[PDB]
Amino acid sequence: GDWSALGKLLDKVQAYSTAGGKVWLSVLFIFRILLLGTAVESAWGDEQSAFRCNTQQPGCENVCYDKSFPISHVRFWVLQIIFVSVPTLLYLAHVFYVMRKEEKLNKKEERGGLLRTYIISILFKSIFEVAFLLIQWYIYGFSLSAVYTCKRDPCPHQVDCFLSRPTEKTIFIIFMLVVSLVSLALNIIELFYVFFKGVKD
Template sequence: MNWGTFYAVISGVNRHSTGIGRIWLSVIFIFRILVLVVAAESVWGDEKTGFTCNTQQPGCNSVCYDQFFPVSHIRLWALQLILVSTPALLVAMHVAHRRHIDKKVLKRTGRSNPKEVELIKNQKFQITGALWWTYMISIIFRIIFEVAFLYIFYLIYPGFKMVRLVKCDSYPCPNTVDCFVSRPTEKTIFTVFMLAVSGVCVLLNLAEVAYLIGRACKRRGDQAAENISKESHGLLSQQTWLTIFTIIFVIPEENSNHC
């Protein structure tokens, strides 16, 4: 799989993300994609050929390997990265739709010159309104996928530790045979590292959710305060004009009647 192309696609959302979102994307690329491509794939490159059992019975090695390693770590992590990263495309689709609408408006108003189109193309959208909801939904999906894969990984490989020796008695093995795993310590280290980074990504996503909710609440509070200020200013203006009207017209009339 071409991870460079995959990163180029999801990095298009980077300019419309929060600061925490940009950190999350950097963690995805540096500590997950690069580690998976540069190191982990080479460590697990001989996972099946290096899995040997002390028997010559045909098919025993393959059956025992499938029993203890039903899904390859590399393929599981690759699928996890794809599913965790694709919700970011929701934001990209939303932004593309907004730009398409803006271009339509320009064409209707007769201002579709190259300069205006370029400004729309490079426009950075604020995370408010419908885009806020799209962004929030994408983060929630990322959290769900991360947690789901951590749970699946725990079900398949409880303890997250790569053992050196496993005992297998599945057919067609003649009896209980000993099977040896290649590079168990190295694989354990990479497994713990990848799972720890996945946990960090979950924390970053939760922090971004809290940040977005806090910023939305602050924006609503500021807007409410501004509305109250405008109402107070309007009432004050009405009272001021009423006082001026009273001084100019009502009081002199009362004085003349009194005389």
């Protein structure tokens, strides 16, 4: 029966959250991790081995691949999710330590403190999501073409190179974009709810 304290921690963490936000956002996180781990990761395995270019010049393939893909999508998404998730872990740790301190105080001697941190955490989650989306839009966009044109040394003039699994990667990119937009919308809804409940005093 060593689970009541965990329930108390869960209740105290979600004091200012809405009823449906909990379920929707947690299930979205689970869906995100499962999709990233099971199917998405396997499709990018042969991203460089199957990358080919039409030329006899040694070294052109390496530089052209580097230019086309400065960073892989999967690792970009891993960084995105880690950055989005860290603030909640920080908040949980802070709440745990605060609860221990309060237990000490209330045992030995038989708003604003936490609300501000929660608001800051939600704001930073949204900011990171938006920043990652903007960076992805600026760098790659939201689609991939089968043929790429390379004009980098030591390749002479321009050369044509061919990618691997472009359509499938485009589909998964669209899926991840939709997931990110949904998460951002839910966080914004939570912010509006907290502010609109705080205005009434």
